[PDB]
Amino acid sequence: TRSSVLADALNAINNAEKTGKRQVLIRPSSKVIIKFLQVMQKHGYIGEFEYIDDHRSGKIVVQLNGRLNKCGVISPRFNVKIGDIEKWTANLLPARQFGYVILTTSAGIMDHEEARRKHVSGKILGFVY
Amino acid sequence: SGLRSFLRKKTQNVIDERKLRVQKQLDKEKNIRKRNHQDVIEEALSRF
Amino acid sequence: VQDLLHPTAASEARKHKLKTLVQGPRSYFLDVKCPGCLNITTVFSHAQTAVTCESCSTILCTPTGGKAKLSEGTSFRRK
Amino acid sequence: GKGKPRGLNSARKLRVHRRNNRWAENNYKKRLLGTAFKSSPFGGSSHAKGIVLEKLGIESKQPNSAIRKCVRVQLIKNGKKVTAFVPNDGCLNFVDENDEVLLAGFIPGVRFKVVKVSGVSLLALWKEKKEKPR
Amino acid sequence: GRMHSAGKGISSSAIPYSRNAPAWFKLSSESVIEQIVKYARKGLTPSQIGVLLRDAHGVTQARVITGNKIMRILKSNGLAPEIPEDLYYLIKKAVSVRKHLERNRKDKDAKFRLILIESRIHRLARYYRTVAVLPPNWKYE
RNA sequence: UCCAACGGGGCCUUUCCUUUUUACUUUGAAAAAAUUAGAGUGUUCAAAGCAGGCGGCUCGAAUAUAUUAGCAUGGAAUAAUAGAAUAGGAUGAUUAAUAGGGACGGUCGGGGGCAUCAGUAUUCAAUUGUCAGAGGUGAAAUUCUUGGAUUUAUUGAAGACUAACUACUGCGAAAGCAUUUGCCAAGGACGUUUUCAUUAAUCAAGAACGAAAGUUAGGGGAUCGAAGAUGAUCAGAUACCGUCGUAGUCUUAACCAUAAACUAUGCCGACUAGGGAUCGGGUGGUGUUUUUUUAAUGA
RNA sequence: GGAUAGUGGCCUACCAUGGUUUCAACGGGUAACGGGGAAUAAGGGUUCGAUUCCGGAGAGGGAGCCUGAGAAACGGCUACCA
Ligand SMILES: [Mg+2]
Ligand SMILES: [Mg+2]
Ligand SMILES: [Mg+2]
Ligand SMILES: [Mg+2]
Ligand SMILES: [Mg+2]
Ligand SMILES: [Mg+2]
Ligand SMILES: [Mg+2]
Ligand SMILES: [Mg+2]
Ligand SMILES: [Mg+2]
Ligand SMILES: [Mg+2]
Ligand SMILES: [Mg+2]
Ligand SMILES: [Mg+2]
Ligand SMILES: [Mg+2]
Ligand SMILES: [Mg+2]
Ligand SMILES: [Mg+2]
Ligand SMILES: [Mg+2]
Ligand SMILES: [Mg+2]
Ligand SMILES: [Mg+2]
Ligand SMILES: [Mg+2]
Ligand SMILES: [Mg+2]
Ligand SMILES: [Mg+2]
Ligand SMILES: [Mg+2]
Ligand SMILES: [Mg+2]
Ligand SMILES: [Mg+2]
Ligand SMILES: [Zn+2]
């Protein structure tokens, strides 16, 4: 049964990127998915995406430009202190500024650099590079 | 190999057989298209 | 090549009801006129019951596996 | 899914699973049950006392032969007879029948060497830095 | 995704996107209410009532046409079920199987299905007790 | 007097009646000294020890460190938790998940249980015609046979079993399931603009069924047949065969719970290639076989 | 109610039948005094900590006491065992 919609969305995006598809369809949609995709967008890993409202969980169509090496979810959403953030970036990213680790904090969903700038912390959602 | 080759042979033969049957139907329909392009007692019984 | 966001209308018509971009029913409703009484009654396309004219108690359709078969002599319009 | 729970509240199942499975290791089992020294040559000790029964290769002709350097020793702890090496034929003179010898780990099958005789190191006797007390 | 079976069928009804009444529908909402009350008085269950209204009266969906679900409309008029409809049919189906097993003791197949039906009842009975739709002392036979 | 911004005060968006807390995270106290990290200092150097110098000098350890539990504090996300939520004139909330359950419609199936019908075949028995062999093997001998064997024809009885149709087709959780008809309940898929609204997945504990063989007590006992007896012990491709045949094979009521009980391969969910054959349901088109106010519906 | 410096099944009398437990009670093993700490490690972890400081407990093994503000003391007392 569907446990993590975000995992399914990110895996579908990964398979589309691997196969070279220029656009991918994600069902069901969620606020967490939209925020995560917005972070990827801001960092340029994805382009435009459009949300289709069907009076149900909804759908998303994402255009892909081939700039995404990998995107994944860290399940379970571990609690992360500010000191621990560096450790996570050491485990999930091939290099030190290559990629981002995305955290859901009291100030919203943001990459680790923004969380450090704002001095906030929370749980970890995933990574993109 | 073994029994599996024999089963492969049968399916291929059936597939080949189907192609011949279908081509016959296409040939016949073409003939019908070309055909379409180009005693008092019997008339009373023509309906039968 | 195809645009998932703006699919062709013919393409979606071929797809299953639930597999389209926004799922919706392929069924419809009908204005069926009673033969005996000439009154008009609404009948669901895939009706599961033998719809009878209220005035005359005459069967208008008979249920089937899919679309209900309208009784002989009953005229109909899509509403 | 890797065949293990990953939920954030599944610590107990992870802990109990590890404890049960740790006993599969032979090293872990021996460490906990205190049976790791059964395989030891001396049963857990680094050196073993013995009694010199005979100098078996004493009649061999070739000097400093491997056989000439073998002595049969009876372990005092359990009474098991074993063979030990002496450093050389010169050191064979200091060893005599019925004397206390200390053995240490080392003709295959000879896995011990004599380090002390009558409480005195052989090398000290060989180097003429001590006299064997009788 | 059938429970108690290996079937993977997806057959279902597809609710239309629009949540407003059809344009062609030109019957008063109140008249629809009286039809629901009459059919329930005759003894039809809410599932069967919706089929009749949709079949012969053009009622696409009671909630869409009237704004309230058939179950709420009946309770607003004093018509309520003794137990939830889905639980009612499961118990009735089990009763029929138990009656057959009484006459036929060698039907090991029917014996197997009774366990599946009964275990389905316990899962459904447990849900309603939690929601308090069903009294906590309620137990199946 | 008007328009565009920037700013203030009053109202309105209620006719009447019924009827947030936690988790998590930030920050601050606290967590003895010694120990650890760190700053200064020519113990002759070092390991160490150590806090005060000049006559106001703006000189000097500036210090830090601890997973959890308790205390105080800032938090918008995430995850649980709540509502006189969008209520009614008997009564509060949102979707209706290509999650699940239930319902309805016409189907589909060698799915199951109880009856019922048929089919030859095997064995046996009655009658019937004829006469020397029949059987079996690689070859023979027990065996049957002039009271007629084997073979022929007309029948009858018993107990099993459903050939050909039979297919890389169908059903069932698996084991398994092929004659007709009827009854009893069950079921997958499909159709649905019907219904409930999270009721779900995996599963220690705990439960039902489980080929063949086998155990207990009745019934039946045709065919085959472990065991046992007996004929022959000559010939290596036909080298273990022939006759009688106990238990068993069948069924009723309980035990046994094992198979190479196989994808030699945990389950649930999502995604990632092309192709056309088949089974079941549904939709549309078309023209052949069809056929007609009995009805009913096909290929 | 008694006893205590005092709360309290701490004990007594009379009442109820309670209390803990698969979120592991109860029982068993421990070459189990606990901690600050020590070692190793890149990080997570693993091991050691009788041993300079803090806290507990003991004075050959059980039991009971006098004095005193304070001890169930042991370089105080009395009995039993060795
Ligand atoms: Mg996977
Ligand atoms: Mg179903
Ligand atoms: Mg199946
Ligand atoms: Mg359903
Ligand atoms: Mg704390
Ligand atoms: Mg649904
Ligand atoms: Mg049905
Ligand atoms: Mg004869
Ligand atoms: Mg078939
Ligand atoms: Mg047949
Ligand atoms: Mg018997
Ligand atoms: Mg099998
Ligand atoms: Mg899968
Ligand atoms: Mg088809
Ligand atoms: Mg008492
Ligand atoms: Mg210890
Ligand atoms: Mg101890
Ligand atoms: Mg200590
Ligand atoms: Mg003391
Ligand atoms: Mg002593
Ligand atoms: Mg004093
Ligand atoms: Mg004392
Ligand atoms: Mg003393
Ligand atoms: Mg003292
Ligand atoms: Zn009429």
PDB file of C-alpha atoms (C1' of nucleotides) in Angstrom, chain B residues 10-11 18, chain F residues 168 277-278:
ATOM      1  CA  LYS B  10       4.256 -25.277 -32.773  1.00  0.00           C
ATOM      2  CA  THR B  11       3.593 -21.604 -32.021  1.00  0.00           C
ATOM      3  CA  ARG B  18      -2.501 -17.316 -39.519  1.00  0.00           C
TER       4      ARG B  18
ATOM      5  C1'   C F 168       2.074 -23.983 -23.976  1.00  0.00           C
ATOM      6  C1'   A F 277      -2.030 -14.669 -30.438  1.00  0.00           C
ATOM      7  C1'   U F 278      -5.697 -16.535 -26.762  1.00  0.00           C
TER       8        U F 278
END
